[PDB]
Write an enzyme that holds these catalytic residues in place. Structure first.
Site, mmCIF file in Angstrom:
data_model
loop_
_atom_site.group_PDB
_atom_site.id
_atom_site.type_symbol
_atom_site.label_atom_id
_atom_site.label_comp_id
_atom_site.label_asym_id
_atom_site.label_seq_id
_atom_site.Cartn_x
_atom_site.Cartn_y
_atom_site.Cartn_z
ATOM 1 N N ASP A 17 0.821 -1.201 0.000
ATOM 2 C CA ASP A 17 0.000 0.000 0.000
ATOM 3 C C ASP A 17 0.860 1.258 0.000
ATOM 4 O OD1 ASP A 17 -1.537 -2.250 0.870
ATOM 5 O OD2 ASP A 17 -3.085 -0.892 1.608
ATOM 6 N N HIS A 30 -1.275 4.620 -0.652
ATOM 7 C CA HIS A 30 -2.379 5.463 -0.187
ATOM 8 C C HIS A 30 -2.046 6.951 -0.311
ATOM 9 C CE1 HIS A 30 -5.336 2.544 1.133
ATOM 10 N NE2 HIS A 30 -4.397 1.854 1.756
ATOM 11 N N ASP A 35 -3.702 -0.463 -3.593
ATOM 12 C CA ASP A 35 -3.992 0.616 -2.646
ATOM 13 C C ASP A 35 -3.012 1.780 -2.831
ATOM 14 O OD1 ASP A 35 -6.212 -0.631 -1.613
ATOM 15 O OD2 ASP A 35 -5.560 -0.501 0.478
ATOM 16 N N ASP A 57 -6.541 7.022 -1.657
ATOM 17 C CA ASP A 57 -7.698 7.044 -0.755
ATOM 18 C C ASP A 57 -7.401 7.328 0.715
ATOM 19 O OD1 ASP A 57 -10.278 6.987 -1.833
ATOM 20 O OD2 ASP A 57 -10.103 4.864 -2.373
ATOM 21 N N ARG A 58 -6.155 7.582 1.119
ATOM 22 C CA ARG A 58 -5.913 7.970 2.504
ATOM 23 C C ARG A 58 -4.770 8.965 2.655
ATOM 24 N NH1 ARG A 58 -8.313 5.804 7.449
ATOM 25 N NH2 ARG A 58 -10.508 5.896 6.794
ATOM 26 N N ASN A 88 -7.912 -3.051 -2.965
ATOM 27 C CA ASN A 88 -9.314 -2.975 -2.565
ATOM 28 C C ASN A 88 -9.875 -1.567 -2.722
ATOM 29 O OD1 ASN A 88 -7.951 -2.091 0.111
ATOM 30 N ND2 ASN A 88 -10.139 -1.807 0.519
ATOM 31 N N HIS A 89 -9.025 -0.549 -2.638
ATOM 32 C CA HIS A 89 -9.447 0.829 -2.828
ATOM 33 C C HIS A 89 -9.397 1.264 -4.287
ATOM 34 C CE1 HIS A 89 -8.473 0.692 1.485
ATOM 35 N NE2 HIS A 89 -9.332 1.687 1.613
ATOM 36 N N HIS A 102 -3.143 -8.270 -3.238
ATOM 37 C CA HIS A 102 -3.433 -7.269 -2.222
ATOM 38 C C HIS A 102 -4.050 -7.885 -0.971
ATOM 39 C CE1 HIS A 102 -5.440 -3.648 -0.446
ATOM 40 N NE2 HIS A 102 -4.249 -3.158 -0.739
ATOM 41 N N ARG A 161 -14.423 -6.645 8.631
ATOM 42 C CA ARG A 161 -14.743 -5.750 7.528
ATOM 43 C C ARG A 161 -15.825 -6.307 6.610
ATOM 44 N NH1 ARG A 161 -8.810 -6.392 6.793
ATOM 45 N NH2 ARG A 161 -8.812 -4.136 7.192
ATOM 46 N N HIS A 169 -3.010 -5.462 2.181
ATOM 47 C CA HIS A 169 -4.209 -4.744 2.605
ATOM 48 C C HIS A 169 -4.136 -4.301 4.064
ATOM 49 C CE1 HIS A 169 -8.105 -3.363 3.338
ATOM 50 N NE2 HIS A 169 -8.831 -4.442 3.110
HETATM 51 MN MN LIG Z 1 -9.619 0.849 5.861
#
Ligand SMILES: [Mn+2]
Lengths: 582, 216, 298
Positions: free
Chosen positions: C54, C56, C82, C85-86, C114-115, C164, C211, C238
């Site tokens: 990741d 992000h 990923d 998204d963050r 996943n994102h 991932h 989740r 992930h």
């Molecule tokens: Mn999360």
């Protein structure tokens, strides 16, 4: 569907983002060339006074435009027309837009005629000072220094009473702004008037209720001491300066410490022993640690500017007993500031007194836990080697270079690779090859690429300092030995070395031992090596003569255009077209 | 001074209160001291075509201060009417964020400051309020910021949403704080811009009240 | 057709952390499609690579990551998903790793996380940022429509599984994955969703992940899977670890998180794995990078 320029300029003000909009405001000058000289005054300027709520970047470029607009209105004969559109920008809520407009106002003041100055710009200072909006009150404090000498003796009194009513204004903000521009005002008056008018304003500010006013008045004290005679210095300046060094807000005691050197150079030497050295003693050992670090960094410039009758004396009686206790306090930050300067004392002290009374404390820093301390000790030691010999201290930093060159965190390792070349030129060749070569060569295999990057360019300077031959003796037989390393990252490192060394290793060397090594690696399985071979080959290509280009590198580049890897092909093809080969 | 639909969005923003007018009201509220910059006459109000509305000022905001040197206030507007006004009621339905994020014709917007205080250089306590308008809605946000340099931070947000022609408007009061000693992992460069640090402050109080429209 | 003239130019602009305009991303994602359209669901990559997890949108930390493992194309890289998204620079982050793939089809390999889906990019930040940076969703549509073309898994030297998420019960052999249609928004169920949402842990067998989507597998799963297709371990990202990488299942699966100090939550160290010529693994922990109007506000 708009009309003459002003409208087409506002049509861009309703555009999406800043740059697209701001770009037109930068044309506000070019629009005024097309406009007649009067049109710039008659039509343009009045639009720029009914201000526009808009981002800072534009209003800033607007203010800059006004400060360069005299020629557009008709010349300095009409400079007064620029004042209205500036006063409004000297009052906008955003601070930076205000100072920029103020600076533009300070500029066009010189362009004013002495008659126009007294009738337009000096009243402009009143409307800003006496204005209700406290923002203008801040702006006013910056326009006094440009006009006070340019006016009549009587109106000078009005401004002084005005500027005085600003240092005692109810709002605390304006009191800060007045304290900031204090030195600029004291600097611009006559000698006898600053003694009676400014020193009062100066004292009440350095004892204000809000700490933000206190320190701001301090930094302006120097600007006052630069003007007064030595006699009146202890009488008017020191009283407030003496107390400010004890203000319960360390923010104040920091300012005097960060400016302690700028004080002695303006106050005098005998007054430095009477009042400054006393305060310095207690500043190196005050409560908040930040103050100590500031003064600790100023131990060097303080000792140097001391007079010659006591330089060696007052340092080993009033200065040293406080130095040792500083090196032994656990605050890792205060010792980082001392480390950078403590060794700048041996040339000021002597030779026998330093190696006996200054060296044993120096080691405690060289072996400290903090890596940032021993790092600064090593960069500021040139002032030590010109008084005491190299080997007298060279045999001690032996493990210090090791623990930094092999620390667990890679940031430390990089930090010392930058200081190696400076350190290499101070220990000569005889040292390095015996000890510092096993460390510098083990850097080209470090886990992190950043060190392998620095270690590569570190060899360029290691040659510039020692000579073209030192590479042919201790470096290149080792670099070329990495081309058999399994890890394809360590294999490539050689190729980045041959690129750098070639630039500063002449021709006879790049062709003797570096060239056949490159062409040997042209058959490596991983393509990351092969396309960099083409990159490196074109890099060192123009260095070597033509006979050796047509001899061994061209057959390879033609061979590398057949590597099925699409990346090498573009690089291989590129590497010939770059230098006159088909 | 704006006007859209049956609404009258009045805009008022000027300088701070004078020194004498401070102590006069400082005793009206029995406050030993008012903010360093008291924007007294600075007010942002929205009236209806019937006589009722909401008003955001500082004077009423300083009333909500309880038994203080940080000027922390739970003020969320002062209900203003003419003997016939909007009512307050707790609710389950609250604001919908996915709506506002949609880009629409931005009708009008003016940021209005209520007060600000430098906190003896120990922090900052600013009470501000801003409001935009859309073609089919209007939205407002009233936010009291607080940063005690070296101790903690507190944000008392209060938003106001009204979908145009919807017999009611919403109001959500969020108040989050945290001592910096608990959020060590956050870079202090964000302790100044609130819009970026609000995400990293844990909710302390959450309230969503719907303001209802009467009839006549 | 030397269009690589501007491709290299874009990267130099992205390395300075400056956006690629709409008219530019429209053409970029078009090429990336043609490059990714040919990659099988299980993309085989050669022995010497550096694999990262990741990111992000932590661009400044991605550049710090480059100074650890090496710049591109010098270092064969592999990303496990990923990318957005963050972080604050989610645009510049994905825009670079995409352009690098279009440039060097062989020096980097990018996988789907996943994102990397229109479902989640709208809430965790990528969409909200794509608006603040351009004023519309076109850029978001250009990328999201391209995210569908990212390969799900990767298979180095015929030995190591790179994805991932985790393993799936409907997926026991790699041929199953190669048969899926990965050209759709990451579903809510099925194996494609599991590959990008599953996570390993201690409890044996399958379990309900907190989740919701995906599953929860343990030692008994990884052993029965890797030994059934001939693998040394699996690489997944992930999750996040304070250590940057975490060994689990008697060293049958490794976790690799490559975003240090995740949204200022745990101050985690970010790590990556380097695969030299033969396959001998070696991780590299690193820390964050230190260097430092009328709006439709909410
Ligand atoms: Mn999360």
């Amino acid at each position: 569907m708009s009309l003459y320029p002003i409208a087409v300029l506002i049509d861009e003000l309703r555009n999406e983002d800043v740059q697209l909009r701001l770009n037109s405001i930068k044309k506000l000058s070019t629009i005024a060339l097309a406009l007649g000289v009067e049109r710039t005054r008659s039509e343009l300027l009045p639009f720029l006074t009914d201000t526009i709520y808009d981002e800072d970047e534009v209003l800033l470029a607007l203010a800059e435009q006004l400060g360069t607009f005299t020629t557009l209105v008709g010349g300095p004969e009409y400079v007064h027309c620029l004042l209205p559109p500036l006063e409004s920008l000297a009052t906008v809520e955003e601070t930076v837009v205000r100072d920029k407009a103020v600076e533009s106002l300070r500029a066009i003041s010189h362009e004013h005629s002495p008659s126009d100055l007294e009738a337009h710009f000096v009243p402009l200072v009143k409307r800003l000072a006496g204005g209700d909006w406290f923002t203008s009150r801040t702006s006013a404090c910056g326009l006094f220094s440009v006009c006070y000498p340019r006016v009549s003796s009587a109106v000078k009194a009005e401004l002084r009473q005005y500027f005085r009513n600003l240092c005692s204004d109810d709002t605390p903000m304006v009191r800060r702004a007045a304290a900031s521009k204090l030195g600029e005002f004291a600097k611009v008056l006559e000698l006898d008037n600053v003694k009676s008018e400014i020193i009062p304003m100066f004292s009440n500010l350095a004892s204000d209720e809000q700490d933000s006013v206190r320190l701001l008045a301090v930094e302006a004290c120097v600007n006052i001491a630069q003007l007064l005679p030595q006699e009146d210095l202890e009488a008017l300046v020191m009283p407030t300066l003496r107390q400010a060094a004890e203000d319960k807000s360390w923010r104040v005691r920091y300012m005097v410490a960060d400016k302690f050197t700028e004080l002695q150079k303006a106050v005098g030497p005998e007054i430095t022993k009477t009042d400054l050295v006393p305060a310095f003693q207690n500043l190196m050992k005050d409560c908040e640690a930040e103050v100590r670090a500031a003064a600790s960094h100023k131990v060097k410039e303080f000792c140097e500017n001391l007079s010659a009758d006591c330089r060696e004396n007052v340092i080993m009686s009033q200065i040293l007993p406080c130095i040792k206790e500083l090196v032994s306090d656990a605050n890792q930050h205060v010792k980082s500031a001392l480390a950078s300067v403590i060794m700048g004392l041996s040339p000021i002290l002597g030779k026998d007194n330093t190696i006996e009374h200054l060296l044993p404390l120096f080691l405690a820093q060289l072996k400290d836990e903090c890596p940032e301390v021993r790092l600064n000790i090593i960069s500021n030691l040139d002032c030590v080697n010109e008084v005491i010999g190299i080997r007298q201290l060279s045999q001690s930093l032996l493990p210090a270079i090791v623990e930094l060159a092999e620390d667990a965190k890679w940031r430390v390792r990089l930090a010392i690779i930058e200081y190696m070349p400076l350190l290499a030129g101070q220990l000569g060749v005889e040292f390095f090859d015996e000890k510092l070569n096993s460390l510098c060569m083990a850097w080209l295999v470090d886990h992190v690429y950043a060190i392998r990057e620095a270690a590569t360019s570190n060899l360029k300077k290691l040659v510039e300092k020692f000579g073209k031959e030192w590479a042919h003796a201790t470096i290149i037989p080792k670099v070329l030995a990495m081309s058999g390393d399994p890890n394809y990252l360590h294999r490539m490192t050689t190729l980045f070395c041959i690129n750098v060394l070639s630039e500063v290793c002449g021709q006879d060397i790049t062709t003797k031992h570096m060239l056949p090594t490159v062409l040997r690696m042209a058959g490596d399985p991983v393509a990351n090596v092969r396309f960099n071979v083409a990159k490196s080959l074109q890099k060192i290509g123009p260095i070597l003569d033509n006979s050796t280009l047509q001899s061994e590198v061209k057959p390879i580049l033609e061979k590398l255009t057949q590597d099925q890897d699409v990346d090498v092909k573009y690089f291989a093809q590129e590497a010939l077209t770059v230098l006159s080969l088909a | 001074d704006f006007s859209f639909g049956p609404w009258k969005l009045t805009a008022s923003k000027t300088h701070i209160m004078k020194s004498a007018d401070v102590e006069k009201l400082a005793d009206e509220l029995h406050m030993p001291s008012l903010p360093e910059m008291m924007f007294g006459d600075n007010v942002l109000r929205i009236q209806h075509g019937s006589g009722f509305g909401i008003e955001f000022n500082a004077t009423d905001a300083l009333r909500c201060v309880n038994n203080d040197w940080t000027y922390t206030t739970d003020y969320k507007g002062t209900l203003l009417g003419e003997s016939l006004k909007l009512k307050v009621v707790p609710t389950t339905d609250h604001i919908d964020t996915e709506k506002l994020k949609a880009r629409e014709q931005i009708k009008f917007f003016e940021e209005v400051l209520l007060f600000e205080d430098e906190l003896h250089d120990h922090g900052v306590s600013s009470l501000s309020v801003k409001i935009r308008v859309m073609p089919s809605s209007f939205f407002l946000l009233l936010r009291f910021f607080l940063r005690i340099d070296g101790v903690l931070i507190r944000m008392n947000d209060t938003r106001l949403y009204h979908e145009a022609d919807k017999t009611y408007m919403l109001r959500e009061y969020t108040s989050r704080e945290s001592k910096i000693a608990n959020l060590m992992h956050v870079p202090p460069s964000l302790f100044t811009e609130p819009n970026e640090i609000s995400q990293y402050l844990p909710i302390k109080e959450a309230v969503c009240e719907k303001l209802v429209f009467p009839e006549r | 057709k030397v269009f690589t003239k501007e491709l290299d130019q874009w990267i130099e602009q992205l390395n300075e952390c400056k956006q690629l305009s709409e008219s530019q991303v429209k053409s970029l994602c078009e090429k990336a499609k043609e490059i990714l359209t040919k990659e099988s669901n299980v993309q085989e990559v050669r022995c010497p690579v550096t694999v990262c997890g990741d990111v992000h949108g932590q661009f400044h930390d991605l550049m710090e990551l480059f100074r650890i493992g090496g710049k591109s194309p010098d270092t064969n890289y592999l990303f496990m998903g990923d990318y957005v998204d963050r972080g604050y620079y989610s645009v510049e982050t994905v825009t670079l790793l995409v352009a690098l793939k279009v440039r060097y089809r062989e020096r980097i390999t990018i996988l789907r996380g996943n994102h990397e889906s229109r479902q989640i990019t709208q809430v965790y930040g990528f969409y909200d940022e794509c608006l603040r940076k351009y004023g519309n969703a076109n850029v978001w549509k250009y990328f999201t429509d391209l995210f569908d073309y990212l390969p799900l898994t990767a298979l180095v030297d015929g030995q190591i599984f790179c994805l991932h998420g985790g393993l799936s019960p409907s997926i026991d052999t790699l041929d199953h994955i190669r048969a899926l249609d990965r050209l759709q928004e990451v579903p809510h169920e099925g194996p494609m969703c599991d590959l990008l949402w599953s996570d390993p842990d201690d409890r044996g067998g399958w379990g309900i992940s907190p989740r919701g989507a995906g599953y929860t597998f343990g030692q008994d799963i990884s052993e029965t899977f890797n030994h059934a297709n001939g693998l040394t371990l699996v690489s997944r990202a992930h999750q996040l670890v304070m250590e940057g990488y975490n060994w689990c299942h008697d060293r049958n699966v490794v976790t690799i998180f490559s975003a240090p100090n995740y949204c200022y939550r745990c101050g985690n160290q970010a790590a990556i794995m380097e695969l030299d010529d033969t396959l001998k693994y070696s991780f590299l922990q690193f820390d964050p990078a230190p260097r430092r109007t009328p709006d439709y506000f909410l």
